Amino acid sequence: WTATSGSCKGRCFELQEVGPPDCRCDNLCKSYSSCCHDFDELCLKTARGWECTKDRCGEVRNEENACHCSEDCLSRGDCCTNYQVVCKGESHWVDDDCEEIKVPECPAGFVRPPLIIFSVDGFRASYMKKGSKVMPNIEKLRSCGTHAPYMRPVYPTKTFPNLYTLATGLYPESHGIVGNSMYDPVFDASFHLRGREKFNHRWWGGQPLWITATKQGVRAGTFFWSVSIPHERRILTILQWLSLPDNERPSVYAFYSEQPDFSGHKYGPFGPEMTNPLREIDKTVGQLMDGLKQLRLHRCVNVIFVGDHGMEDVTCDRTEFLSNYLTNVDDITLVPGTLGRIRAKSINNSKYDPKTIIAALTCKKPDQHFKPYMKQHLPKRLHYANNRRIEDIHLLVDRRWHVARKPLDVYKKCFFQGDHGFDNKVNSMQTVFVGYGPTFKYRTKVPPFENIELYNVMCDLLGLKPAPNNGTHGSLNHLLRTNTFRPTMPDEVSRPNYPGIMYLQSEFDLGCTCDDKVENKLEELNKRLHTKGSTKERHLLYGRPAVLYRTSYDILYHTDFESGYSEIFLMPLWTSYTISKQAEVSSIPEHLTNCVRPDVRVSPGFSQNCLAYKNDKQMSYGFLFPPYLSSSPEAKYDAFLVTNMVPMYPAFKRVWAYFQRVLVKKYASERNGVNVISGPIFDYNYDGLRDTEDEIKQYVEGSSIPVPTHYYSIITSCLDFTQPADKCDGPLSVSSFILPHRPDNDESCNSSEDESKWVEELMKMHTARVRDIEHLTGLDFYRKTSRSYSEILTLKTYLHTYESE
């Protein structure tokens, strides 16, 4: 209840929200059923429309008008945005040449350039090129400012998760807005786009930009606009707030447009009906820039033009139905559409089995347009698991498709021709970024980057300290003229040990054998220098990784590879090697098929043993440095050290062996050498972060050898591929992956075929950023390079996507 018989006189779009049951005149009042009686009349004026005409010039102020063309309007801050153009012979901002903004050119009393975020729903990245003829104001922002070819949204590529990610720098799993609809079992409450529960603060985690600003003494305009407030009025309100006195005026503002998403759902991303919504958004941009230029703020304000996600062609006839797969379809609740989320209809039924539901959805039809996953098996790059609101069963839906429970769900609910929500690597889901202003660079193109990075930059733009977030602060410094954040490398926590030869062969009782006893001061001094780190400059190109947590580990040198070996986990944390373009692939000789050799630098007590692998009927083993790539028959013995061994399911050894035998060599040939760092990952609680030893849920049977949940590799070479990986003078090029360590290959529907038909496809699906691997391992890579740290940070955030151009 609100006693709505107070007044909005003098309060129109008040910045501080007053508490019920006093009536409201702030933006949001419409959405709460709480506007004062006279809100529409006073605050939502429309008389005479939105543009000055020649006859209105110097008119007698009529307070009823939407905007004014009277002489006093400039000092009142309430002119129509085109006032000076019609009545003072001024040009539109878009018709002016662009001129570099070297320093902020701001009115007196401005303590810092304001930030205006112009956010557009459903604005697919390719609209920038494809709609360029109808979007002159946007194209000027884009070519005169700083722009990326596209910006990667977060998964799911829905509206609410992406806008809140923009505001917080957090993955949806951390901020809690994990979809457009959600169930929270601890609350026992549901969140929906329609309705009232969405207004409860307990859904909304992290710290959004407006709260960060406020807590730090920077004033913020509203980020949420009521849908009934038209766009012209949102602009005029921002422009009015910008005319407030210094002590009252916000420093950060947001505009939001429901377009082009609204029309995109109806007509598809490139429907002929899409041209008009793009023209209209551009006109709104035009209104802002003309308005700012009137207030002499157009070389003062930083403007960000940013989308939440793109839009794909999706129709009713491209719907897979769970009823075509399951028989107990009534025992389930599906969150449907461009992603699937499945849970039990009743918490009272313990006859519901997630395992049988998954198997019933796995590889059942030759062209099947979705893939079921337990959430913890989703690609780690999605970061979509560590929240009680994300259901255990997830369906990743092919682009252009929907999933629904029963056919009745579609026809009793073709309307739609466009949708979004798919895997955030998909080209059609990409969206836009442009920055324009004194703090951004002039006429600069930057590489594509992820929307999680922007919060840090917006904080830098406003002189704020960002709350803890998932951005990598410094990785977007290259967007900025000034205001950069000078990041420093994290301090190493654990220094390595460098063991020499300390154990006799007979001290080991590991149950391992090797056919290796065959007996030279040329080649004895040779192996010696190799075990002290002589070829280490070849195999460790960027310094050793730093260990950022407290642990016990040894650096081990070898002719062909170097490793950091963990006495705690009994295996390397990392193994580093370089494979030149010229390198030869050889086979594992027959006599060495089952060879595992004691490492005389490492105690029996800190070594693995072969007996555990014999006894464990499910678990086998692989090697981190591949025997196939040894530089010599003699160097090959190093690859069979017990210290290079890691536990591997036979089903996973198929994947790993193909990567090591075929793909490493393919990459070296293509990229002119590669440096590879590979290792295990333990993430049993699927939080994206390195497990402590007490979190490990699985060991090789009857041993203390922990089983990894994943294996990673980071594959680096010269960006100028005319230079070999081992002698690169400039910027680097990287691709990485985090492969799930699974006892079956149920994920790959074509896995009974040759590895050449499926393995690389799997690896591509599990592409990763170096930064993802850092979180998962507590390691810090690229410590010793000739590149600036900001550049390295950008490299660590790079994702190799495997989408076409």
Ligand X SMILES: *[C@@H]1O[C@H](CO)[C@@H](O[C@@H]2O[C@H](CO)[C@@H](O[C@@H]3O[C@H](CO[C@H]4O[C@H](CO)[C@@H](O)[C@H](O[C@H]5O[C@H](CO)[C@@H](O)[C@H](O)[C@@H]5O[C@H]5O[C@H](CO)[C@@H](O)[C@H](O)[C@@H]5O)[C@@H]4O)[C@@H](O)[C@H](O[C@H]4O[C@H](CO)[C@@H](O)[C@H](O)[C@@H]4O[C@H]4O[C@H](CO)[C@@H](O)[C@H](O)[C@@H]4O)[C@@H]3O)[C@H](O)[C@H]2NC(C)=O)[C@H](O)[C@H]1NC(C)=O
Ligand Y SMILES: Cc1nnn(Cc2cc(C(F)(F)F)ccc2OCc2n[nH]c(=O)n2C)n1
Which residues are known to be catalytic? 159
- By CB under 5 A, residue 687 contacts Ca ion: yes
| Residues that contact Ca ion, how many (by CB under 5 A) | 5
Min separation Cβ 427 and ligand Y, Å: 22
Query: Of Ca ion, ligand Y, K ion, none, which one sits near residue 254, judging by CB under 5 to 8 A according to partner kind?
Result: ligand Y
Query: Interface residues for Cl ion in 126-185 (CB under 5 A)?
Result: 179-180
Question: Which pair of structure tokens corresponds to residue 739?
Answer: 């492969």
Min separation Cβ 550 and ligand X, Å: 12
Closest to 700 measured CA to CA, from 743, 641, 638, 740: 743
Taking CB under 5 A as the criterion, the residue among 287, 559, 745, 794 binding Na ion is 745
Are the C-beta atoms of 341 and 335 separated by less than 8 Å? Answer: yes
- By CB under 5 A, residue 208 contacts Cl ion: no
DSSP string, 388-454: TTS-SEEEEEPTT-EEESSTHHHH-----SEE--S-TT-GGG-EEEEEESSSBPSSEE---EEGGGH
Query: Of Cl ion, ligand Y, Ca ion, none, which one sits near residue 163, judging by CB under 5 to 8 A according to partner kind?
Result: ligand Y
For residue 737, give the amino acid letter: F
Q: Where does residue 805 rank: exposed (0-12), middle (13-18), buried (19+ CB within 10 A)?
A: exposed
> What's the gap between Cα 138 and its chain centre?
25
Question: Is 159 part of any known ligand binding site?
Answer: yes
Element counts in the chain: helices (H) and strands (E): 22, 28
Distance CA 427, CA 412 (A): 31
Taking CB under 6 A as the criterion, the residue among 126, 386, 704, 801 binding ligand X is 386
Question: Cβ-closest residue to ligand X?
Answer: 205
Query: Interface residues for ligand X in 202-221 (CB under 6 A)?
Result: 205-206
Min separation Cβ 184 and ligand X, Å: 9
Q: Which positions touch ligand Y (CB under 6 A)?
A: 28, 117, 119, 160, 163-164, 166-167, 198-199, 201, 204, 208, 223-225, 254, 256
Are the C-beta atoms of 217 and 464 separated by less than 8 Å? Answer: no
Half-sphere exposure of 723 (CA within 13 A, CB side): 14
Are the C-beta atoms of 643 and 572 separated by less than 8 Å? Answer: yes
Query: In this structure, is the dihedral angle defined by the CA atoms of residues 55, 56, 60 and 65, taken in order, positive or negative?
Result: positive
- By CB under 5 A, residue 308 contacts Zn ion: no
Min separation Cβ 368 and ligand X, Å: 30
Distance CA 737, CA 735 (A): 7
355 vs 413 by CB, closer to Zn ion = 413
331-360 burial string, b = 16+ CB within 10 Å, else e? ebebbbbbbbbbbbeeeeeeebeeeebbee
Are the C-beta atoms of 456 and 500 separated by less than 8 Å? Answer: no
Stretch that binds Na ion, among 273-281, 746-754, 770-778, 780-788 (CB under 5 A): 746-754
304 vs 390 by CB, closer to Ca ion = 390
In sequence order, the 6+-apart residues with CB closer than 8 A to the CB of 9 are 38, 42
Are the C-beta atoms of 439 and 373 separated by less than 8 Å? Answer: no
192 vs 528 by CB, closer to ligand X = 192
Closest to 560 measured CA to CA, from 647, 675, 669, 654: 675
Question: Which pair of structure tokens corresponds to residue 528?
Answer: 């010696």
Min separation Cβ 771 and ligand X, Å: 9
Min separation Cβ 211 and ligand Y, Å: 8
- By CB under 5 A, residue 333 contacts Cl ion: no
- By CB under 6 A, residue 176 contacts ligand X: yes
The interface mask with ligand X, positions 445-484, x = CB under 6 A, is -----------------------xxx--------------
Are the C-beta atoms of 740 and 776 separated by less than 8 Å? Answer: no
Question: Cβ-closest residue to Cl ion?
Answer: 179
Residues in binding site for 1-hexadecanoyl-sn-glycero-3-phosphate: 159, 180, 261, 420
Which residues lie near Zn ion (CB under 5 A)?
Answer: 261
Residues in binding site for Zn(2+): 121, 159, 261, 265, 308-309, 420
Which residues lie near K ion (CB under 5 A)?
Answer: 613, 616, 620
Residues in binding site for 1-tetradecanoyl-sn-glycerol 3-phosphate: 159, 180, 261, 420
Which residues lie near ligand X (CB under 6 A)?
Answer: 170-171, 173-176, 205-206, 383, 386-387, 468-470, 687-689, 775
Residues in binding site: 121, 159, 180, 261, 265, 308-309, 420, 683, 685, 687, 689, 691
Which residues lie near Cl ion (CB under 5 A)?
Answer: 179-180
